[PDB]
Design a protein around this ligand. Structure first.
Ligand SMILES: Cc1cc(/C=C/C#N)cc(C)c1Oc1nc(NC2CCN(Cc3ccc(S(N)(=O)=O)cc3)CC2)nc2ccsc12
Ligand SMILES: [Mg+2]
Lengths: 412, 556
């Protein structure tokens, strides 16, 4: 690929100038060895003081891998890079991917290092391996080839990838392959044994076109909007009915026709919270009518590709996390729950970081983009620790919730 | 003639769309002109500048200044205009090492690389932008016009290009001599090692032999400074480090400017003098911009200052870093949102100290502040030593476990152990998860008239206890908190409380232990006195019993 593709920034925007955050000694050492080899291979080059730009870097370990990996935080460059319609007016996201019984995620980011980057754009990819305690100036590099995690990389390489996959797609017309950034998502409705067979049948095809051997197994079969469920009890205390009326009143913002009048009637007076209140027939019917309403889907819910996806997360305790994805309040496009996060029974922040990556993966499969997270954590705690548990080659956007939402109860 | 390598030129550009400077030269006295001709004639013979013709359309004004005892004129080219129009550079010298992060070195030599500076050539395509004019005697001949061939002193890019050029020249020498350390500061080059003075003096000569490859002569720094090195405000001694003398002045009249200079010294000193505090002296600056305004010191600000004078009475020092020992960080609560800490490897031998001050907020608690201090120290330690320290914290393991398992946010603090150093951080109240059997149930409510600011707060209970209190100059949110306060005041040690105030719930569910609101603080004092409190929420105006009854009581 001698010819580079002309790449520009958006009008009236300069390159990124993002501060490098401090790194532990062992991560710096990892980055020095990685970048030394990358420099020997021509993928990056040392830059001079005439280049003032910067994008942060750090070091991670892919899922269950002892080898250090470099990850560049290109979030700032990506939003400053021109919008892309490299080949066509757009890539119609495959609505069938989310329907496949199984979906496997292959890391094909290594393919990017075979395409040279436009010489005039390279300066905007500058990054710094920091020193410890400022004892030496950081090591300054820029990219010579398509970098992993950059918006332009999948767009520029798309003509090549589509040709690499054509023979495989030709034989398997029922296998849906989707690409997001550095990752290929390969899904099939086959029996789990038959599905896996083709994945290795797909990378070997890739290895002969110029790999990683890493995978990820999803099952979008079970992704939807979880229903609102109400308790089924034989005896209701005053407290139980107050909680139920509160939940139903919350639900009434989502579902029309929710009523609480007959249930509130039961609370006539000033009763001790632990007192048992018998349900009347009128309240039982009303509760049944509410229960029926809650079985149906929410009215007027639709994905608008022009708006951002928003993801909220609640800590429920004991390793459980609930989350909702929406664009407009009370119009959830998907909701879910997580339990027993792996290898983090005593670390909230690791559990939250893993939830963020799982939710982002689901968002990519369903809509082809990442949501903006509302994180139940103080900014300084998240910003100190999240890179310690990150294992994905993309990074979403996030904001911080500092006031406890009352609705955590309702998703319990 | 020994061939020397050329120092690689950095390509420089002007900011997009901008042209070079075109500033008029000022008229100069005959004496200043004579001086500038003399000076520039010498710079010309050394290659620093070159005469140019009149086709160059750019110009930067030049001046002639002098010192009182120095019986000579000084040249000065004012590159302010050119700097506004020159591209940004990578400024690779903003941060400096912290002494506590350095390992001691047996021997340190200083080299002067002032003359090496002038061997760094200026990008030739950019030289035209540096043109200046020496006016002629009596303006009867064309002025003498020059341009720079070297990095001009005062030009935007000279510091970054100079340091970058040296670093690249030094890199092979540092990589192939891992038993020395090299550090550059201004025109100074600092070389240290743990070699015997013999092998050390040899590495220095080898470094000189290396620099000659680019024609760079480097003698020793005039009047070799004995220890300690006076550098960036520190005293670097062979075995110890400290800040330079911290001397607090005596005064009976303190202005808004005096208090700013005292916090600066105190802040600087807090990196080695443990227990420094600057809240009460900072509070006297909350909002003002006239520095000469005099602000009386509160009896609390005087105490704080006197406490600092006690700490500052005698000098202290930190030790240098030993990578083979553990790194340990200990935190103490000081009060009023203030925190101090020490980082050390052996007991009583601090690497450095520090402080942390609570963020501004209507509410907060000690555990959140301790967590924030931990994150700050964590980040500082990574900067200085490239690793997180082990923490010693004045909070019981069981207190922390209760906090993070029940707190609604994710939270985390790295490996740490309890240190029994009062005052200990604790949880002051914990609400029940379930309603309490046999405890009286208070339904509370409050309301206020927006226009008149008149309101009411009260409660009704399942035992028929009731109260409504009329309030003046209040708001809905205030009456809602006042109602919870009354229920706490009038109930036994165990109580169930039912509110419809999402605002009140949001406050209490944040688990504050102190507030800027005196009413919230009174509520906190009541919660601390209870054995069990269950707080439940219901939506207003839905006909919920008890809540409906009290709502009408406080709504007129
Ligand atoms: C080498 C050096 C010197 C200075 C001084 C500036 C001034 N003004 C600053 C820095 C950042 C330096 O840079 C590094 N300094 C160290 N360590 C130091 C070495 C010096 N000692 C103090 C000392 C020791 C011996 C004598 S003596 N007996 O020769 O008179 C005099 C003073 C403390 C530790 N480590 C590194 C690692 C990478 S850079 C670098
Ligand atoms: Mg009310």
């Amino acid at each position: 690929p001698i010819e580079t593709v002309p790449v520009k920034l958006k009008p009236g925007m300069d390159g990124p100038k993002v501060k490098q955050w401090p790194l532990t000694e062992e991560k710096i050492k990892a980055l020095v060895e990685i970048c030394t080899e990358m420099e020997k291979e021509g993928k990056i080059s040392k830059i001079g003081p005439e280049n003032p730009y910067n994008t942060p870097v750090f070091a991670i370990k892919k899922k269950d891998s002892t080898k250090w990996r470099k990850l560049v935080d290109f979030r700032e460059l990506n939003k400053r890079t021109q919008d892309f319609w490299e080949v066509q007016l757009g890539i119609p996201h495959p609505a069938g991917l989310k329907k496949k019984k199984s979906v496997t995620v292959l890391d094909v980011g290594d393919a990017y290092f075979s395409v040279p980057l436009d010489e005039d754009f390279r300066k905007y990819t500058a990054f710094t391996i920091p020193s410890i305690n400022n004892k030496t100036p950081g090591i300054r590099y820029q990219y010579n080839v398509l970098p992993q995690g950059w918006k332009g990389s999948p767009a520029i390489f798309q003509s090549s990838m589509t040709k690499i996959l054509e023979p495989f797609k030709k034989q398997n017309p029922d296998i849906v392959i989707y690409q997001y950034m550095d990752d290929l998502y390969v899904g099939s409705d086959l029996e789990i044994g038959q599905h896996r067979t083709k994945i290795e049948e797909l990378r070997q095809h890739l290895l002969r076109w110029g790999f990683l051997w890493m995978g990820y197994e999803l099952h979008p079969d079970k992704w939807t909007v979880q229903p609102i469920v109400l308790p089924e009890k034989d005896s209701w205390t005053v407290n139980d009915i107050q909680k139920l009326v509160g939940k139903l009143n919350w639900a009434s913002q989502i579902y029309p026709g929710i009523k609480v009048r007959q249930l509130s009637k039961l609370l006539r007076g000033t009763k001790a919270l632990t007192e048992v209140i018998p349900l009347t027939e009128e309240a039982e019917l009303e509760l049944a009518e509410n229960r029926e309403i809650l079985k149906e889907p929410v009215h007027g819910v639709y994905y608008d590709p022009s708006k951002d996806l928003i993801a909220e997360i609640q800590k429920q305790g004991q390793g459980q996390w609930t989350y909702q994805i929406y664009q407009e309040p009370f119009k959830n496009l998907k909701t879910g729950k997580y339990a027993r996060m792996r290898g983090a029974h005593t670390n909230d922040v690791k559990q939250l970081t893993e939830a963020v990556q799982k939710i982002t993966t689901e968002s990519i499969v369903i809509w082809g983009k990442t949501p903006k997270f509302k994180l139940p954590i103080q900014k300084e705690t998240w910003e100190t620790w999240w890179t310690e548990y990150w294992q994905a080659t993309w990074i979403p956007e996030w904001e911080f919730v500092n006031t406890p939402p009352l609705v955590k109860l309702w998703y319990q | 003639m020994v061939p020397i390598s050329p120092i690689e030129t950095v390509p420089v550009k002007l900011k997009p769309g901008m042209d070079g400077p075109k500033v008029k030269q000022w008229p100069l006295t005959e004496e200043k002109i004579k001086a500038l001709v003399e000076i520039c004639t010498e710079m010309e013979k050394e290659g620093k500048i070159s005469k140019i013709g009149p086709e160059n359309p750019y110009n930067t004004p030049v001046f002639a200044i002098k010192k009182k005892d120095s019986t000579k004129w000084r040249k000065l080219v004012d590159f302010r205009e050119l700097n506004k129009r020159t591209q940004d550079f990578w400024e690779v010298q903003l941060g400096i090492p912290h002494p506590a992060g350095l390992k001691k070195k047996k021997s340190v030599t200083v080299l002067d690389v002032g003359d090496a500076y002038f061997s760094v050539p200026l990008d030739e395509d950019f030289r035209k932008y540096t043109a200046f004019t020496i006016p002629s005697i009596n303006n009867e001949t064309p002025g003498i016009r020059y341009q720079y061939n070297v990095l001009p002193q005062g030009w935007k890019g000279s510091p970054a290009i100079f340091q970058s050029s040296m670093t690249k020249i030094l890199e092979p020498f540092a990589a192939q001599n891992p038993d020395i350390v090299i550090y550059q500061y201004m025109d100074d080059l600092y070389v240290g090692s743990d070699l015997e003075i013999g092998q050390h003096r040899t590495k220095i000569e080898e470094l000189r032999q290396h620099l000659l490859r680019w024609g760079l002569t480097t003698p020793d720094k005039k009047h070799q400074k004995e220890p300690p090195f006076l550098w960036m405000g520190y005293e670097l001694h062979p075995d110890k480090w400290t800040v330079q003398p911290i001397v607090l002045p005596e005064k009976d009249s303190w202005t808004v400017n005096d208090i700013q200079k005292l916090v600066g010294k105190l802040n600087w000193a807090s990196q080695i003098y443990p227990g420094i505090k600057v809240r009460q002296l900072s509070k006297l600056l909350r909002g003002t911009k006239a520095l000469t305004e005099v602000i009386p010191l509160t009896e609390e600000a005087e105490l704080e200052l006197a406490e600092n004078r006690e700490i500052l009475k005698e000098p202290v020092h930190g030790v240098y870093y030993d990578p083979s020992k553990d790194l340990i960080a200990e935190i103490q609560k000081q009060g009023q949102g203030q925190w101090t800490y020490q980082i050390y490897q052996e007991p009583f031998k601090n690497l450095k100290t520090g402080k942390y001050a609570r963020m501004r907020g209507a509410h907060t608690n000690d555990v959140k502040q301790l967590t924030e201090a931990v994150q700050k120290i964590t980040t500082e330690s990574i900067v200085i030593w490239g690793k997180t320290p082990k923490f010693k914290l004045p909070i019981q393991k069981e207190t922390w476990e209760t906090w993070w398992t029940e707190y609604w946010q994710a939270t985390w603090i790295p490996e740490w152990e309890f240190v029994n150093t009062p005052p200990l951080v604790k949880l002051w109240y914990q609400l029940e998860k379930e309603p309490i059997v046999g405890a009286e149930t208070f339904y509370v409510d409050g309301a206020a008239n927006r226009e008149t600011k008149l309101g009411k707060a009260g409660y009704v209970t399942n035992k028929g206890r009731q109260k409504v209190v009329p309030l003046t100059n209040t708001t809905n949110q205030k009456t809602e908190l006042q109602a919870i306060y009354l229920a706490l005041q009038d109930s036994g040690l165990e109580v169930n409380i039912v509110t419809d105030s999402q605002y009140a719930l949001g406050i209490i569910q944040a688990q504050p232990d102190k507030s800027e609101s005196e009413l919230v603080n009174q509520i906190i004092e009541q919660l601390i006195k209870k054995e069990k409190v269950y707080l439940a929420w219901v939506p207003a105006h839905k006909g919920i019993g008890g809540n409906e009854q009290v709502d009408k009581l406080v709504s007129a």
